[PDB]
Amino acid sequence: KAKSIDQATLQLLDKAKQDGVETVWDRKADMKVQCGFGSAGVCCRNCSMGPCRVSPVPGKGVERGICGATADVIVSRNFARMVAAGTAAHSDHGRSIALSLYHTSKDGDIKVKDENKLKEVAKSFNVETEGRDIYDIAHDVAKEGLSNYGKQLGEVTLPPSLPEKRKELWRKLGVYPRAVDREIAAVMHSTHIGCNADAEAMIKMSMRCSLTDGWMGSFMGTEFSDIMFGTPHSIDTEANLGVLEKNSVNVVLHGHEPLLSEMVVEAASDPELVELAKSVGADGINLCGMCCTGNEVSMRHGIKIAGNFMQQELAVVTGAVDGLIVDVQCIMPALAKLSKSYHTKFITTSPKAHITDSIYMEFDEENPLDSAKKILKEAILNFKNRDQSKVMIPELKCKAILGYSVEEIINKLDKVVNTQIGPMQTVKPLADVLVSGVLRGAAAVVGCNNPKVVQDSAHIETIKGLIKNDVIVVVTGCAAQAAAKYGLLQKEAAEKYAGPGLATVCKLVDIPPVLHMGSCVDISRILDLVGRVANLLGVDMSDLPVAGVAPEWMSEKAVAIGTYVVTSGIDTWLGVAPPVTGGPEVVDILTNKMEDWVGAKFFIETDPHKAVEQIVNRMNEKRKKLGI
Amino acid sequence: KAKSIDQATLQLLDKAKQDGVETVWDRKADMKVQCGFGSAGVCCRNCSMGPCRVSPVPGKGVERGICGATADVIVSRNFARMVAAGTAAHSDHGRSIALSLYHTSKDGDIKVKDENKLKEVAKSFNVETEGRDIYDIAHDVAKEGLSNYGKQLGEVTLPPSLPEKRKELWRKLGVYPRAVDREIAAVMHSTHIGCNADAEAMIKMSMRCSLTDGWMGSFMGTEFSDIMFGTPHSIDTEANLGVLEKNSVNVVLHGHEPLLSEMVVEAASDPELVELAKSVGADGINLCGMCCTGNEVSMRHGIKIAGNFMQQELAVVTGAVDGLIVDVQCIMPALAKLSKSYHTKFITTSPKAHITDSIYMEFDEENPLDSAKKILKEAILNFKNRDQSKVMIPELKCKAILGYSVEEIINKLDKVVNTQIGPMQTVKPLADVLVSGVLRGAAAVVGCNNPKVVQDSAHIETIKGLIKNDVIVVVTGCAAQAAAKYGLLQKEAAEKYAGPGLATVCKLVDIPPVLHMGSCVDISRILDLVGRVANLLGVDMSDLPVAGVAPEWMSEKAVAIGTYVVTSGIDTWLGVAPPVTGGPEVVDILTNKMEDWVGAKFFIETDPHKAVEQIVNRMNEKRKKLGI
């Protein structure tokens, strides 16, 4: 089968074959037929009595592990641990952001750039703002956010966009969230040998844990990032590997933590570093981003996006990356080995993400700007080691428009508001187009790449099908970057791919049919948006014609995201089967019984066209339930 | 191979074969040859690009996972997740204890029974005590303990017995602990795909996480349990399955959390329940404990111990267990199936541990005594369903002495203190016998059973070898219960098994050669003891001739325990190989490089006699280093 639908990706794969280096596709081929027990989730290693593998087919073979655990128990515990790991990644990101907020000052490297957003957040956290210094408010808000992570007494703080009905449903179900780290610890405790051996209770614990990701960790990370670095607005950028410059220093920012990439962007305008780039024979400094850190700097500053997850290696294959600076998460360790075949300096910066044989330059949060400057200086000085005979940059780049935060979307919707009617600054125009049926619904396309799927194929096919069916699409993460590379993040795309209702809406509001809402933590924005719509219509989020899709997901973070999206009341389609087919009870809970609990459920569909059809049918069913 | 060295265990295995019921041994046999990849730790399932298996033999076969992770990376992440799971189990136990402390009242079900212990703990937590109400002090202490779990700013609180040198070494190494749930979340975050791919850093993160178990979670759980339920003192009890009564109601308490078992013990003396037991035709109520909850109630009240981990099923096989009340952890789910073959009521009580097809009676912490009375009444009423023709109780039980908390040990040591010299109430006599060489050292024997080892064989052989070599032995958990069943927890054992120096010490102090220090969380007591000795000698804990042994461990909790014991500076022998042989770098870190870091290291030895020899040699070389 084809490795990708992206032509630049294919050219660089040919180059990697010529250079004798191996990619993620080569390692996937080397893995051959993957273990059936692990693929079905019926393998357990939770204690040293094991490893235990039970039959994925009930009634045949070994039925129980040594402790007596059934296939359903093993599957449910494995699923819960995936959710806990994803929640941990997102919560650690949000915790770093909250600490950065706590360390803001007027004359420091980290300031408050959006005071209005900070005051609204302070209102949401019961922090007084009138007649107060802005940094005192910021510190109080950071304290409340940090308490959300580890409070042992009392209730956590949740955003006002979350409907009261959803909160009450969670409380009745027993999944109402506690402090984030406490829920992660609870999930890890209940999967220990000889604890929870009941699939339904295990799934409910995992949902409870995922809620602390969706509504607390990711939400606080996003809102505090907006406070410190600015709320995203409509902004132009370029996407795909063609953004690399042969005649300039190329600095590629990979990872998830935004403070480092923000400081690197600021350092790139330093006169001394620009002069240094000129002195090593380069035209200038060309910052390019990848994955979620690329999404953040692109949403807030228009930094060009070099590529998504499965392109990271190919960025090095060009031979033009002088410095690849990585913080945490979704950083293929093979990059270190790959960096030996080129001049590239592979720089790790976080104590959480040491990588063997990489150059470690710890990013100092006490002096973020100076630390970023020294890291960037190492990248710039590496330009002298460039071998221009090994350089091949495909001439394939695509224009994209992004920056669609909830605030930006509301500002755009204000155009189609009659002044004599109003109100302004609400999601009411979006609610109106959804209720009238001009738009059939809204769908979130999120997730990673996965060698099991032709890279970016499922993302593009799902998005095109949805917008052709007058479903407005919001995108995050690597799916958003696939849309950017393909050319869907363009106003012109409205008349090229969208159906009649969505084309009319795009023309009236002057937006692309596909709205890039940011990184994987920025999925919280989507929740926020949906919540607002629900609160405007006086219904729960499970009554709306909305859906989420993860066509090509790979990470534990994706599992946690899908779990909290379903738990919030939004049906979720998974384009890659999770390792649960071995447990019939777990499959039945996730795809059938979940609808009785939270009004939504998982759909597993590896065919994107069938997924689009199912999404449209489900949205029409919910519309008929709602009367619209 | 023999299944056990215990004769009562063998008789009940014959009965289980005659009854056509499966045991843990039968399921272990059914599992046959366990997966080599999982056994070596070279299998990874951390993302849905996998499952990935790399060769346990370097230089052959597949070398890297799909993301590029090496065998060392996969092994180190798997080990770290085991540590995180064990830390989560212990920390959740301690968190429940702290919450119970927070709800103590003068006229409530949960009171303060050891005010002196509470005042000393309050001193350790910087809580004022002079001229204050005892329950105000208790609530402040509980608040400080709870803050240890989830504080995001500042430093955690550690017991005064921990040497300053050990803390400084931890700070220099980068493993100084943070809040417990924060460290669990950090480990889970760094094992996520594309985060940490460096074995040394991964092992250091796991050590940092395990410290929050050893010195914060388990320590606080133990000390708060002492405050609420009484400090253990020397007390007599009986051990092994013979403690069951044919003519009495048999109520078996299995699990770890002590509040439920304490309330059940209190409810058993209720006049209405005793009258009800008489009216259902029984002579009375016979409470028996298993595993750690049995250890707690036995340490504090002399409740008879029915058996350790791999005996739990056999307790039901007797046909005499009218009620089996379980809370969390090390509860084989197969019990639910097994109790169908008998009249036994298998009662789950904790929302953390639901077991399918068991009778769920949620233990209400708000009204603990009434809830315990209701559960106990269900067990008593089940006596009418006893089938006395199916009853077979082995006439095999053994006298044991336990209750050796640090306070009790100090009280015993006061006997050999010359009044004209002093001081009293110190560990000084123990330090003196260790320094003079009358005792060669002290060894902690802890851990579970494991079907991979003849049950209780390794525990007994290791203990007998150590005490024969004039090494005083402290025991916890299932190892302590194996010692109890065998008969080592007896004063007479001093003249039957101990060497000359240990026999003299036992005669002078009037103690058994093997000291039962309580449950698995009570391993913190051992740390406390060692710390005091170190603080009395002005040395670090790694300079002492001390060691820990886990001859037959199975649980993730055991992994976390061994990790924090080594990190504290105490060499640890493992009688069951952990899944790390696939990663040569991880093996080298755990067994060789750890000594450079923390002055102690792991020893993997499956032969108990060889383990005793190695322990004696290591203790002698540490003595020669210390000059004693």
Ligand code: SF4
């Ligand atoms: S999933 Fe289990 S059975 Fe399959 S290779 Fe991995 S450890 Fe072995």
Ligand code: SF4
């Ligand atoms: S927890 Fe149970 S099923 Fe899992 S490895 Fe241990 S004995 Fe086997």
Ligand code: SF4
């Ligand atoms: S994290 Fe890497 S090694 Fe582990 S399953 Fe995913 S791709 Fe394979």
